[PDB]
Amino acid sequence: IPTVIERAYDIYSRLLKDRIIMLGSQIDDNVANSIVSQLLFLQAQDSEKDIYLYINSPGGSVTAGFAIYDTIQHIKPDVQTICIGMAAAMGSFLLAAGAKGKRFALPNAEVMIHQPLGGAQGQATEIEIAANHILKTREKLNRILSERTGQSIEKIQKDTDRDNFLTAEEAKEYGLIDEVMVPE
Amino acid sequence: IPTVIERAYDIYSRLLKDRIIMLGSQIDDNVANSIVSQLLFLQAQDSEKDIYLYINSPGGSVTAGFAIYDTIQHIKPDVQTICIGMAAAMGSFLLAAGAKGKRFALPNAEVMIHQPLGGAQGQATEIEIAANHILKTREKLNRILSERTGQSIEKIQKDTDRDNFLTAEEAKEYGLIDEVMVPE
Amino acid sequence: IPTVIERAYDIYSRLLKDRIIMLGSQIDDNVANSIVSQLLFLQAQDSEKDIYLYINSPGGSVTAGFAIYDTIQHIKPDVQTICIGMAAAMGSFLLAAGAKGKRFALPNAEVMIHQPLGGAQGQATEIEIAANHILKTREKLNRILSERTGQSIEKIQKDTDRDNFLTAEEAKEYGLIDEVMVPE
Amino acid sequence: IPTVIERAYDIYSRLLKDRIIMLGSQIDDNVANSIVSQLLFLQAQDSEKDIYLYINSPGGSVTAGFAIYDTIQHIKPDVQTICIGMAAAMGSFLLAAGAKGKRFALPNAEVMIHQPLGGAQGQATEIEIAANHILKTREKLNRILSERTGQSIEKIQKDTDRDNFLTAEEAKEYGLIDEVMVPE
Amino acid sequence: IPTVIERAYDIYSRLLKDRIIMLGSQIDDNVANSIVSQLLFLQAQDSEKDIYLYINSPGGSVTAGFAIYDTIQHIKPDVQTICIGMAAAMGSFLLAAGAKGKRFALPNAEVMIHQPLGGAQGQATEIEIAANHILKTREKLNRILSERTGQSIEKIQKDTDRDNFLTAEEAKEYGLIDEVMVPE
Amino acid sequence: IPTVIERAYDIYSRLLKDRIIMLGSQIDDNVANSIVSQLLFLQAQDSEKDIYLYINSPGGSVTAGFAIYDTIQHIKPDVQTICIGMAAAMGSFLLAAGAKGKRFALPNAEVMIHQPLGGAQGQATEIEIAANHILKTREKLNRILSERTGQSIEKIQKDTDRDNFLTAEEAKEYGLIDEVMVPE
Amino acid sequence: IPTVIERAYDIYSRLLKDRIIMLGSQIDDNVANSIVSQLLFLQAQDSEKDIYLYINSPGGSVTAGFAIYDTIQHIKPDVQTICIGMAAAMGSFLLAAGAKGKRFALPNAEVMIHQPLGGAQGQATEIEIAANHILKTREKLNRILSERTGQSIEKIQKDTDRDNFLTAEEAKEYGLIDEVMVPE
Amino acid sequence: IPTVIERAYDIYSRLLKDRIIMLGSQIDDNVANSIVSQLLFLQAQDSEKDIYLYINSPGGSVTAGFAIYDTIQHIKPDVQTICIGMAAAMGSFLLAAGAKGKRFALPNAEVMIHQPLGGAQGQATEIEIAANHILKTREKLNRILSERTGQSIEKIQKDTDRDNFLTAEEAKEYGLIDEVMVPE
Amino acid sequence: IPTVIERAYDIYSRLLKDRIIMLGSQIDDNVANSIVSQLLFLQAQDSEKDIYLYINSPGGSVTAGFAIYDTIQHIKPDVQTICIGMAAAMGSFLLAAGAKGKRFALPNAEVMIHQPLGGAQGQATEIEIAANHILKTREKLNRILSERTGQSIEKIQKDTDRDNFLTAEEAKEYGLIDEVMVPE
Amino acid sequence: IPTVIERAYDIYSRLLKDRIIMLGSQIDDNVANSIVSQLLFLQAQDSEKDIYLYINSPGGSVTAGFAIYDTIQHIKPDVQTICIGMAAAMGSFLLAAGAKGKRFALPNAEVMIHQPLGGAQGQATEIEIAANHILKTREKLNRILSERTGQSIEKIQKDTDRDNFLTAEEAKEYGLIDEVMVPE
Amino acid sequence: IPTVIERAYDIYSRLLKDRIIMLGSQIDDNVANSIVSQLLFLQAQDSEKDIYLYINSPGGSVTAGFAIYDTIQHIKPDVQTICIGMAAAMGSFLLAAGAKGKRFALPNAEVMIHQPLGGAQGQATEIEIAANHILKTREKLNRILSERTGQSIEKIQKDTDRDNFLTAEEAKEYGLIDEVMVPE
Known part of the structure; x- marks a missing residue:
């Protein structure tokens, strides 16, 4: 919403x-x-200086999440992830997708992990196709999460069966973040 | 809707x-x-004299269908099934469920068979449970249909993949009905 | 709506x-x-004495109509059809379905014939299936109408391409009715 | 609404x-x-004693009106028509359709005549069919009205171009009724 | 819907x-x-002759179910339970509540068990009260179910975590019913 | 819903x-x-033989409840109260209002007590009047409940601050009922 | 809404x-x-000169509030908080989160504290998870509020059970603010 | 809406x-x-030159009003208030809040004072809290009004019980304004 | 949404x-x-240097898709296509439409192919026209897809009968893309 | 949507x-x-250099179309028409209205021609006026189409009776376009 | 919508x-x-050089029309009117209001004239007032139209009774325009 002078920006652009x-x-x-787009732009500006991604998100579309995830992995600069407020579902997935050693959360930020949600309507055959797809998506999510937290696929599976709320400390313990940024 | 005298009945009761x-x-x-209820009542009245079930139905709930199906099989009297107009989905299933030799359709009546429809919302686990259930329901339907038409399970599966519209003659040929009642 | 004494009826029951x-x-x-149901009941009452069906109808479901059509042909009594007001679409089909020599229309009644309407939503394959079904239903209707009017299938096809309004006299000329009942 | 004893009727049945x-x-x-249905029933009871049709109606479906009209003409008993309140559009058409010499109105009843209303949606061809139909219905209405009032088709055409409100006296002068029933 | 003569009943009352x-x-x-009310009435009529409760139900209110359950246990007559179609959730609970040795299902009937569903809106304190209540209700349900199936509380808890669909044979194996009524 | 013969009743009338x-x-x-009305009628029938009031209710209007409460107290027959399913809020108030020694609950019936709910919209003065009225209503309810359970006003006040769920045993312990009807 | 010149700003940017x-x-x-974003930007501009946060807010999302809270604590500059109008719920939480000695309210500003609100829908297990989470969130809020006001956790718990409205003076007395800014 | 040149402004900014x-x-x-924000900005520009606040408002949020009121009193410049059209409720409150000797109304402007409005939904306890809060707010308003008009708290209480419409002269007489600006 | 300086751009323009x-x-x-428009503009700028089209789309209008497809083929520069997130339906069609050797997907991007969807309402003749058109469109799509993937028309037809979800690797194997861009 | 630099344009302006x-x-x-407006402006800029009109349109208002049509014919520069995606109804009319020899379509663009659609509500007289108007409009359209394609009025009439889908090649064959732009 | 450079304009401003x-x-x-406003502006710029008013309008408010009409007559420059597409009702009124000798239509533009439309709700006296006003407005429109076309008031009255559609040539013959601009 608000504007800054230098030429004129909105606060986010600044x-x-x-x-x-x-x-x-x-x-x-x-x-x-x-x-x-922001990621691609920042890379084209300077491919050495690393990038800061603040995350306060309830989650959302799994494929939209992957577009971000893959783009983070694809570009040269390190992307630091900093969780403020809440990082849930695909949000926490992205939190854990920051460059290793540079994934943070503020002391009172919360992290939540759980399985993906979807739906299927129609014929038995169609429902089956949708069910297979969502199960396959869960495997893909769990696999990549296993790699970035160091937890086994079996433990992720069990821990994401229902909504699982984590404190910043617990998130660090789990391997979703590296550090909880103590007040300076 | 309309009333008959004898004591007063509505036409269906008559x-x-x-x-x-x-x-x-x-x-x-x-x-x-x-x-x-009508079936159970009719049996209590006389368990020998058979029963006439006219069917003009687009289908509907699979379990509600099975209530009717199982009740037909469970009572003593033969239940003749006569298709007028249209018998689709669970409706055609019930058509096929009449006493052997006594399943009829009028010359211009239509029969349609297809796979069951459903839906699943929520978690991956939840969708999987629903998917399994509807696929299991399809096997049950196909199995029972195989027994009453004399067609193989494999053929039924293929024939019900999409909407399949049958004439009265084709329905007899298929083994859903025994006779097409030629005008008297 | 109104009641008659004899025991109590509504006017239609009477x-x-x-x-x-x-x-x-x-x-x-x-x-x-x-x-x-009325037809079946009337036949159970007396299978000789013929039946009078007054028709004032804009039409409706093709399969519902065939349930009626087939039942008329199936029972023993002659069913006279008498068109008052309007008999359109499936309504005029049933008008033409009365016992030969006993299909009437009052002098200012109207008859309208046209092709069946429908709809299809979804995948290309599904639309195709629906399209085939409605084309096949049209052939069925035209064939039967051909038999009852004495007009050729080709003429019916052409004449029902768009809404076709007929006077009582034109309906008689077409072979949909036998007589127009002149005022007594 | 209310009930009368004798066996029980509603007021209209009585x-x-x-x-x-x-x-x-x-x-x-x-x-x-x-x-x-009431007319047919009344005839079946006694085909000599004449019938009283009270009319207070804003009009409605032209075909539905013709069903009534043609039925009045077709039965043996004379049908007296007595307008109370308002007889408009198809309503006044029916008022005029009573047995000659026996079409009445109460002193403060109103009559209104005007052309038929309708609609057409779709292709140019479709609109043309609809337009032709409603113009033909107007000729039909004017023709019969000419016969029953004694006014020329040309005068009726002109007088029904817009809404035309008539007093009971003016209705008699026009030939829509024979007598205005003076208070007894 | 339909009526029976003897005095007049609706089919259910008959x-x-x-x-x-x-x-x-x-x-x-x-x-x-x-x-x-039915149960109480039947008892007042004859407290010896046993009662037949057909069940085809998706379930519903837990407390409403318990009103039924408790009344079954409270009256003198044995209440046979016969599952036709589907008995799910509180439905299957009532199925299992029939007199021991007299709980049946038809061959193609389905049974489903799962945990109770609820909701809580408002202050943290209020949500806690609601959570405690629904957990307590679950214990109550599992406890009574344990008694009537012979399965342990722990197994019930695990088996009802998600939707659990059972065939008639599986239901008997589980101890929800005693017999599957084979077609006579 | 269903009907009984003797003359014809609905089940509740029977x-x-x-x-x-x-x-x-x-x-x-x-x-x-x-x-x-049922209470007044039953009294007029026989003022000695006592009455049975089964209660499965989530509660409702406080003044409507009092109409019942006061009528129970006003008539000569003892009114037994039997809780099946759930008696909440004004429901449990009525439960406790039965003749002393004849207030029962089935074993798995639930009781819930809590403070009354309301609303006020408009001017400060108007809101005050509403607030006073609802507080005065709470005193009245607590007072009467104190008399019938034997618990102190202060205890009732505290126990009804939030939703308070009670088992049948707990309700007997509280003095809302006298006996829990163990299965016969 | 309005614009200021210098380059063009909206009033907030100015x-x-x-x-x-x-x-x-x-x-x-x-x-x-x-x-x-505003906080981060202000710090990057000058990490010494402190920041003014005016607060007129009814509250809102607890996690969104924490993103703000944690950011205030994380940055170098002192953040003064000044309550104008109303600071309620998470609003008053943030008011109390300003740098110690620099938390103000205008004389007629109001502060309101109460427990967090939430909701839970679904299975007993799911409701339990939600209940636990909101109760934990309350502990977290009470703990941090205890630290910044100097009041004991037990007192906070009691004082936030229902809506608690405080004047500016009462808020200072409570330790939510340091000073009430007397008109200059 | 419209724009002025100098650099471009909307009329208000100008x-x-x-x-x-x-x-x-x-x-x-x-x-x-x-x-x-406008007030704070204007002070930062020049803390001597006084400020003109034109008021045509039906009123609105009491707390939102107090944010304005307190900011007026808190800043250095005098704020002149000029009522054009209508100043009602919180609107007339703010009118009366301008610097003494500099509160104006145009000759045909109207002023209306009345008590505050609100609402309360829920438990008896909850309604009581809301009732107390709104009554307390009314005292606060009345007290501050008394100070600025010179009328006693008791008189304000009586005069604001219902809607009280005042002419500009009547408003001056009341002490809400100092002068009515006669046309120049 | 956000802005960049150089003159001011939005991020996409940049x-x-x-x-x-x-x-x-x-x-x-x-x-x-x-x-x-973007493609035409980019070509007018420089017709040699190739263009990058990132694709994260669920698909959409087939004709709108073809406007893009045809424009890609029509312009001189090579158009690289890079799938991030998801490329489904007409989306995946466009993916496969990039310059050969320059069609990419990120490692966790998904591709889905299936037949086109549509609808038809109205007369039999009208439905037939719509059905023919959508079948013809499917042939057109399959044909072009066949050319760009190197798969046979028959295989495409079978593979697109229902929703077919593909991993990046599977998409390469299919010939929709050339390379999956491994993280750099 | 996007912006270009030179001064700033939106992509269409560029x-x-x-x-x-x-x-x-x-x-x-x-x-x-x-x-x-764009056409008039482009002419005022340079009345020699010809103009490029890309068309992807489902059609729309006939009179609005004619405003465009007439303006194209009225200005000096040749207007090239290039169909991308789809040109239907009035869209395809305008496609055919480009300068002869300069009417193009991309290879996979579609063209559709059909009769105009409309509506008429009201009195018979009113419907007749509307019907005449739309028929006259069809003649006007067919006439002008005849002139630009070289097909006879009678052929156009027949070919536009229903929806008529054309490929780019077929469109060229029809004389709606001159050339299909083969990929460069 | 689109922008032009010179300073930036939207096409209409250009x-x-x-x-x-x-x-x-x-x-x-x-x-x-x-x-x-555009007219007043154009006058202030140059009161000699005449103005071009293109008109493609279905009509609308009669008083809004008159504001335009009177403004055209009041300003010094000649206003040419050019009808493109359609000029109906108050649209055609304005077309005819251009400077004599400078009222044009393009060859395929349409013009339609008819009476004004309105409505009146309420008391007999109120309806009468509305009726009188709309009749007076018609006289006013017809009078001015008479002056500008040279047709008599009686002819206008007759010709605008219903919708009257005119071709460009017919419009010129009527005196609504002076010339039809033949393609250059």
Whole structure:
């Protein structure tokens, strides 16, 4: 909303100039499309200086999440992830997707992990196709999460059966983040 | 709707007196509950004289259908099934469930068979449970249909993949009915 | 709506006692189910004395109509058809379905014939299936109409491409009715 | 609404016993169907004693009106028509359709005549068919009205171009009624 | 819906005369009130001759179910339970509540068990109260179910975590029913 | 819903003949008005033989409840109260209002007590008047409840601050009922 | 809304130039995302000169509030908090989170504290998870509030059971603010 | 809406340059937030030259009003208030809040004072809290009004019981304004 | 949404300066019209340097898709296609439409192919026209897909009968893409 | 949507600078008013250099279409028409209206021709006026189409009776376009 | 919609620079306000050089029309009117209001004239007032139209009784326009 002088920016654009990206909403195709564009742009500016991705998100579309995830992995700069407020579902997935050693959460931020949600309507055959797809998506999520937390696929499976709320400390213990940023 | 004298009946009740049951609507728990009750009543009246079930139905709930199906098989009297207009989905299933040799259709009546429809919302686990259930329901339907038409399970599976519209002649050929009642 | 004494009837029931059936509405599964029931009941009462079906109807469900059509052909008594007001679409089909020599229309009654309407939603394959089904239903209707009017299938096809309004005299000329009842 | 003893009637049924029919609503297929049924019933009871049709109606379906009209002409008993309140559009058409010499109005009743209303949606071809039909219906209405009032088709055409409100005296002068019933 | 002569009954009341009760809908306060009232009436008629409760129900209100359950246990007559179609959730609970040795299902009937569903809105304190209540209700349900199936509380808890669909044979194996009524 | 023969009743009327009243719904003016009428009628029939009031109710209007409460106290017959399913709020108030020594609950019935709910919209002065009224209503309820359970006003006040769920045993311990009817 | 010249600003941006942030709305993810961004930007500009946060807010999302809270604590500059109008719920939480000695309220500003609100729908297990989470969230809030006011956890718990409205003086007395700014 | 050149302004901004603020709408949190910001900005520009607040408002949120009121009293410049059109409820409150000797109304402007409005939903306890809060708010309003008009608290209480419409002269007589600006 | 300095751009425009186009939404006439314009503009800028089209789309209008497809083939520069997130239906069609050797997907991107969806309402003749058109469209799509993947028309037809979800690797194996971009 | 630098343009304006006009939407009075303005402006710039009109449109208002049509014929520069995606109804009319020899379609673009659609509500007289108007409009359209394609009026009449889908090649064969632009 | 460079304009403003006004919408108070303003502006710029008013309008408010009409007559420059597409009702009124000798239509443009439309609700006296006013407005319209076309008031009255559609040639013959602009 508010504007800054230098030429005129909105507050987010001003921060973007310092290689900061704010994710402050649910993740859908628009948000993903914006985040990805910001990442590509920041790389084209300087492919050495690393990027800061603040995350306060309830989650959202799994494929939209992957567009962000893959883009983070694909670019040269390290992307630091900093969780403020809440990082849930696909949000926490992205939190854990920051460059290793540079994934943070503020002391009172919360992390939640759980299985993906979906739906299927129609013929038995169609429902089967949808069910297979969502189960396959869960495997893919769990696999990549296993790699980035160091937890086994079996433990992830069990821990994400229902909503699982984690404190910043517990999140660190789990391997979703590296450090909880103690007040300076 | 209209009334007959003898004591006063509505037209359907009057026909019930002659052991005739009209199925003229979609199949849901109320309809099943009424059809089942009529069947049990008719048996208590006379367990020898057979029963006439006219069927003009687009189908409906699979479990509500099975209430009717199982009740037909469970009582002593033979239940003749006569398709007028249309017998689709669970409706055609019930057509096929009449006493062997006594399943009829009028010359211009239509029969349609296809796979069951359903839906699943929520977690991956939840969707899987629903998917398994509807696929299991399809096997059950196909198995019972195989027994009453004499067609193989494999053929039924292929033939019900999409909407399959059958003429009265084709329905006899298929083994869903025994005879097409030629005008007297 | 109104009641008659003898025991108490509604006006339609009173007329049913004289073997008169009123069709005064669009044709759907409920209406068909009731008309069919009346026909079956009337035959059980006396299978010789013929039946009077007055028709004032804009049409409706093709399958519902066939339930009626087939039942008329199936029972022993002749069913006279008498068109008052309007007999359109499936309504004029049934007008033409009365016993030969006993299909009437009052002088200012109207008849309208046209092709069947429908709809299809979804995948290309599904639309195809629906399209084939409605084309096949049209052939069925045209064939039967051909038989009852004496007009060729080709002429019927052409004449029902769009809405075709006929006067009582034109309907007689076409072979949909036999006589126009001149005022007594 | 209210009930009378003798066996139990509703008020309209009690009056039907005296060969009185009440038309107190707009004319549609249900209403027609009921009025027609009453007429046929009354004839079957006694084909000599004449019938009283009270009319208070804003009009309605032209075809539904013709069902009534043609039925009045077709039966043996004279039908007196007595306008109370308002007889408009198809309503006034029916008022004029009573047996000659026996078409009445009460002193403060109103009559209104005007052209038929309708609609057409779709392709140019479709609109043309609809336009032709409604113009033909207007000719039909004007022709019959000419016959019953004694006014020329050209005068009727001009007088019904817009809404035309008539007093009871003016209605008599026009030939829609024979007598205005002066208070006894 | 339909009527039987003897005096006039509706089909359900006619069956009630033979000590049969139909449960054909979801269970709520109205349904319970009715079922309870039936049971009380049947007992007052004869406290020896046992009662037949047909069940085809998706379930519903837990407390409404308990009104039924407790009334079954409270009256003198044995209450046979016969599952037709589907008995799910509180439905299957009532199925299992029949007199021991007299709990049946038809061959293609389905049974489903799962945990109770609820909701809580408002302050943290309020949500806690609601959570405690529903957990307590679960214990109550599992405890009584344990008693009637012979399965341990721990196994019930695990088996009802998600939707659990059972065939008639599986239901008997589980101890929800005693016999699957083979077609006679 | 269902009908019984003797002359024809609905099930509830048949039970009313045995002095049994079913309360199976929320309590509002209509329900109160009906229960009150049933009580007055039963008294007029026989002022000695006591009455049975089954209660499965989530509660409802406080004043409607009092109409019932006061009528119970005002009539000569003892009114037994039997809780099946759930008696909450004004429901449990009525439960406790039965003749002392004859207030029962079935083993798995639930009781819930809590403070009354309301609303006020408008001017400060208006809101004050509403607030005073609802607080005065709470005192009245607590006072009467104190008298019938033997618990102190202060204890009631504290125990009804939030929703308070009670088992049948707990309800007996509290003094809301006298006995829990163990299965016969 | 309005614009200021210097280059063009909206009024809020103009104030942001002087290190003033306006919180004039309910707190959600957008608002948090903006406030946080403003804070980060202000720090990058000058990490010594302190920041002014005006608060007129009814509250909102607890996690969104924490994103703000943690950011305030994380940055170098002191953040003064000044309550104008109303600071309620998470609003008053943030008011109390300003740098010690620099938390103000205007003389007629109001503060309101109460427990967090939430909801849970679904299975007993799911409701339990939600209940536990909100109860934990309350502990977290009470703990941090205890630290910043100097009141014991037990007192906070009691004082936030229901809505608790405080004047500016009472808020200072409570330790939510340090000073009430007397008119200059 | 319209734009002025100098650099481009909207009309309001152009006036803001001359230290004029327009309040032309109902008072809510946005409006207050904007007015407050304008006030703070104007002071930062020049803390001597006084400020013009034109008021045409039906009133609105009491707390939003107090954010404006307190900011007026807190800043150094005098704030002149000029009522054009209508100043009602919180609107007239703010009118009376301008610097003494500099509160104006145009000759035909209207002022209306009345008590505050609100609402309370829920438990008796909850309604009581809300009632107390709104009564306390009314005292606060009345007290501050008494101070600025010179009328006793008792007189204000009586005069604001219902809607009280005042002419500009009557408003001056009451002490809400100092002068009515006679046309120049 | 956010802004960049150099002159002021939005983030997408900034990327367009580097010949990058973002497709991050469903495909309709507006989106196509924008994408086409971007392509034409980029060619007028430089007809040698190739273009980057990122694709994260659920698909959409087939004709709108073809506007893009044809424009890609029509312009001189090579158009690289890079799938991030999901490319489904017409989305995946466009993916496969990039310059050969320059069609990519990120490791966790998904591709889905299936037949086109549509609808038909109205007369039999009209439905037939619609059915023919959509079948013809499917042939067109399969044919072009066959050319770009190197798979046979027959295999495409079978593979697209229902929803077919593909991993990045599977998509490469199919011939939809050339390379999966491994993290750098 | 996106912006280009040089001074700042939106992408369409940038293309307008090169005498390109995009028609990407249905045709109504706004769209027409814009396209017309663009044509007039482009002429005032340079009356020799010809203009490029890209067309992807489902059609729309016939009179709006004529505003565009007539303006194309009225200005000096040749207007090239290029169909991308789809040109239906009035869309395809405008496609055919480009300067002879300069009417193009991309290889997979579709063209559709059919009769105009409309509606008429009201009196018979009113419907007749509407019907005449739309028939006259069809003649006008067919006439002008005849002139530009070289097909006879009678052929156009027949070919546009229903929806008529054409490929790019077929469109060329028909004389709607001159060339199909083969990929360069 | 689109933008032109010189300083930046929208297309309409660019054309306004050349003294061209586009009327491409229904006429209401906004549209009138805008057109009027453009006229006053153009006059202030140069009161000699004449103005071009293009008209494609279905009509609208009669008083809004008159604001435009009177403004045209009041200003010094000649206003040419050019009808493109359609000029109906108040649209055609304005077309005829252009400077004599400078009222044009393009060859395929349509003109339609008819009486004004309105409505009146309420008391007999209120309806009378409305009726008188709309009749007086018709006289006013007809009188002015008479003056500008040279047709008599009686002919106008007759010709506008119903919708009257005119071709460009017919319009010229009627005197609504002077010339039809043949393609250059």
